[PDB]
């Protein structure tokens, strides 16, 4: 996260770290959606152009974390993956269209002060909150700038951007399965996600029922926090039929 701040304790109890066993390292963020299911970006698990194709046994999920590097004894929980499920029409060839995956955990994680699921949006909540200018919140342990790493989880609030402004910022084809967020060049505020934040959540707090909803998944950006560029997020509501089909089946 670029131009964010340190998270407060238990501020994002759904935040998940995707952790490589191999060389022990941070791969991505992710989110807890129930005691057995974690949501992330497909490109955190599969990205042929960079020879990425992880299997269940390569990875752990670390839940309840605040420190990036510390083993947070009695706070974090570390979970093994039973099964990865990648959207069958994830487009890694062109523009990361449908950048979404689920991971089923071997065992249910115990909820605590630090560990608690986020809600997934219904059509009504999506229609109300996904409006240009409404702010969401992005969290992760990725780079503090495009070209340091944080001691602790970082947070930034960013406004949703009008679709034409998103399309006009980039040569990449923007789909209805994506939305963009960030400040315009001379607004006086900035900030973005960056390398290592992808797969983490873009959340909004409903003013109707005071619950947090995951509207997006950190997907991609040109660099981090560039003037005139925006961050692109997977539109979670648009892909909720697939999410429901995977959980109902498995």
């Amino acid at each position: 996260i670029v131009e964010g701040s340190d998270a407060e304790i238990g501020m994002s109890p759904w935040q998940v770290m995707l952790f490589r066993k191999s060389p022990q390292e941070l791969l991505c963020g992710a989110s807890l959606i129930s005691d057995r299911w974690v949501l992330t970006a497909a490109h955190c698990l599969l990205y042929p152009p960079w020879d990425k194709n992880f299997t269940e046994n390569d990875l752990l999920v670390r839940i309840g974390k605040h420190s990036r590097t510390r083993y947070e004894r009695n706070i974090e929980k570390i979970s093994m993956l039973e099964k990865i499920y990648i959207h069958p029409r994830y487009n890694w060839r062109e523009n990361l269209d449908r950048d979404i995956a689920l991971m089923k955990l071997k065992k249910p994680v115990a909820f605590s002060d630090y560990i608690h699921p986020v809600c997934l949006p219904d059509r009504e909540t999506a229609a109300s909150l996904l409006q240009a200018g409404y702010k969401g919140r992005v969290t992760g342990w990725g780079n503090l700038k495009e070209t340091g790493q944080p001691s602790v989880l970082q947070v930034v609030n960013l406004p949703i951007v009008e679709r034409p402004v998103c399309k006009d910022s980039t040569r990449i084809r923007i789909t209805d399965n994506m939305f963009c967020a960030g400040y315009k060049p001379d607004e006086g505020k900035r900030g973005d996600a960056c390398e290592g934040d992808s797969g983490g959540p873009f959340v909004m707090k409903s003013p109707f029922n005071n619950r947090w909803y995951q509207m997006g998944i950190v997907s991609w950006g040109e660099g981090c926090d560039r003037d005139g560029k925006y961050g692109f997020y997977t539109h979670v509501f648009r892909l909720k039929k697939w999410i429901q089909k995977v959980i109902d089946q498995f």
């Binding site: 066993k21 022990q24 390292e25 752990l60 590097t69 510390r70 083993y71 570390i78 093994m80």
Partner: peptide, 11 residues
């Protein structure tokens, strides 16, 4: 180098 070693049971 970077990360604290996690319990040997998770590996």
């Amino acid at each position: 180098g970077d990360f604290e070693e996690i319990p040997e049971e998770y590996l």
